[PDB]
Design a protein around this ligand. Structure first.
Ligand code: NA
Ligand code: NA
Ligand code: NA
Length: 480
């Protein structure tokens, strides 16, 4: 229908482990759709190492909070039945469902096995730093409580090629199983970045290749997914992710949107990865996340003309999923690069009102993060979502021509009456800027949807208007 698409990551790292999240998502469906959310990215929905696991310490991909394993039936988010009910609600409310997919490793093995392994250089996994010797690694998975439902596949050490914990001498080291190779090709930071955490899956084995492809199809069909969020893909052999994606699209009738999480503040690396994927998916705009972080951290001295420089959205807008923060970047987490409250509005306006990129709203920003006394930004975000949903249409014009004051416009499209907007912001002292919003909007008087500026901007005969912004603020003018 031409409507702009907006994704929302429906969770934050410190969410309460009350098992009521799927129920919350179910009840929130109508409100989310009305607000402008068109797709929901659910966290890993399968059994993790423990009930409180956020989902990345993935134990059993076939247990969606249905079997008593790892000390619980439900996952941190709820039961399988509640999840399916939530998805049903999202579907009836015209919201796509993307499932987080964790296939890089497994955790919470039921038992250890004796394995010959060598210690490697943490900063160069290609380099062994010890001779081979026997360690006890958590590689045995029997999925007892599942009783082979859906799949009788069992994991053993020979399905993996590394771990970072030896249970025998109880020490942390980056271990490569003797006689096994690190996956390839993978990111090259640390020489070979195949290993990240837990028991690292070795995709050189056909049985592993087929198991995850079959699980993928089972998962897709079980939850009637509309796409996936691929976890830690820079650590998974590129050739396999591509095969896996092609396999799923082949097995599923519905379209499948795919966004990969290749975590690197390097647009070149992300473009190379997309090349390897034949551009068959989009990637989170990690460089842009760091651009926002750099600006938030530096303060007003940050030159706004560079805010989009080096970002994926700047180079391949149609293959970039833009975001401001996520469960990994929030305070105290592994990829911390949190955008402070003062800059956050500007960052969200940037990903929500521009034509390029598939923007994602963070649950933590939307509803807040009580754990860190971070307020819900729903008020501000809803206004930007309103702008995106009803006004961000038509030919765009950019004005990243000042170190403090930058902005852009959208002429709007005939198909969508009254559409059109002018976004202007400043990370330092306030200011103004003449911008072209389209001669077809001549004579209109636009006002700030955010309420941050009371100026009424009347579009002149040539389609130009002078928009104003206060300092460290953002305004989005529309014909309302
Ligand atoms: Na890996
Ligand atoms: Na961030
Ligand atoms: Na500045």
């Amino acid at each position: 229908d031409g409507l702009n698409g907006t994704m929302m990551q429906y969770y934050e790292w410190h969410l309460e482990n009350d098992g009521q999240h799927w129920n919350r998502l179910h009840d929130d469906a109508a409100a989310l759709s009305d607000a402008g959310i068109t797709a929901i990215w659910i966290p890993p929905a399968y059994k993790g190492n423990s009930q409180a696991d956020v989902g990345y310490g993935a134990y059993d991909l076939y247990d969606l909070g249905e079997f008593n394993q790892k000390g619980t039936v439900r996952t941190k988010y709820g039961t399988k039945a509640q999840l399916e009910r939530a998805i049903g609600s999202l579907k009836s409310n015209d919201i796509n469902v993307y499932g987080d997919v964790v296939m890089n490793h497994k955790m919470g093995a039921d038992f250890t096995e004796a394995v010959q392994a060598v210690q490697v250089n943490p900063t160069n996994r290609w380099q062994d730093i010890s001779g081979a010797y026997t360690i006890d690694a958590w590689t045995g998975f029997d999925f007892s409580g599942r009783n082979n439902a859906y799949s009788d596949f069992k994991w053993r050490w020979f399905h993996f090629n590394g771990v970072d914990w030896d249970q025998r001498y109880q020490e942390n080291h980056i271990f490569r199983f003797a006689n096994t190779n690190w996956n390839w090709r993978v990111d090259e930071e640390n020489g070979n970045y195949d290993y990240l955490l837990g028991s690292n899956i070795d995709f050189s084995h056909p049985e592993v290749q087929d198991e995850l492809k079959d699980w993928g199809s089972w998962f897709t069909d079980e939850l009637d997914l509309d796409g996936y969020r691929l976890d830690a893909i820079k650590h998974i052999p590129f050739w396999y992710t591509s095969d896996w994606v092609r396999h799923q699209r082949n097995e599923a009738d519905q379209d499948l949107f795919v966004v990969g999480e290749y975590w690197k503040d390097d647009v070149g690396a992300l473009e190379f990865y997309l090349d390897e994927m034949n551009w068959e998916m989009s990637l989170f705009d990690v460089p842009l996340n760091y651009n926002f972080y750099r600006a938030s951290q530096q303060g007003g001295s940050y030159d706004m003309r560079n805010i989009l420089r080096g970002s994926l959205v700047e180079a391949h807008p149609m293959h970039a999923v833009t975001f401001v923060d996520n469960h990994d970047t929030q305070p105290g987490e592994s990829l911390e690069s949190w955008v402070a409250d003062w800059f956050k509005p500007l960052a969200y306006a940037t990903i929500l009102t521009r034509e390029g990129g598939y923007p994602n709203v963070f649950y933590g920003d939307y509803y807040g993060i009580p754990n860190d006394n971070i307020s819900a930004k729903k008020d501000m975000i809803d206004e930007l979502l309103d702008a995106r949903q009803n006004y961000a249409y038509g030919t765009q014009h950019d004005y990243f021509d000042h170190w403090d004051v930058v902005g852009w416009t959208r002429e709007g499209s005939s198909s969508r009456p009254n559409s059109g907007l002018a976004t202007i912001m400043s990370n330092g002292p306030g200011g103004s800027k003449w911008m072209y919003v389209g001669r077809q909007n001549a004579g209109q008087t636009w006002t700030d949807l955010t309420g941050n500026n009371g100026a009424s901007v009347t579009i002149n005969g040539d389609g130009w208007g002078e928009f104003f912004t206060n300092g460290g603020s953002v305004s989005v003018y529309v014909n309302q």
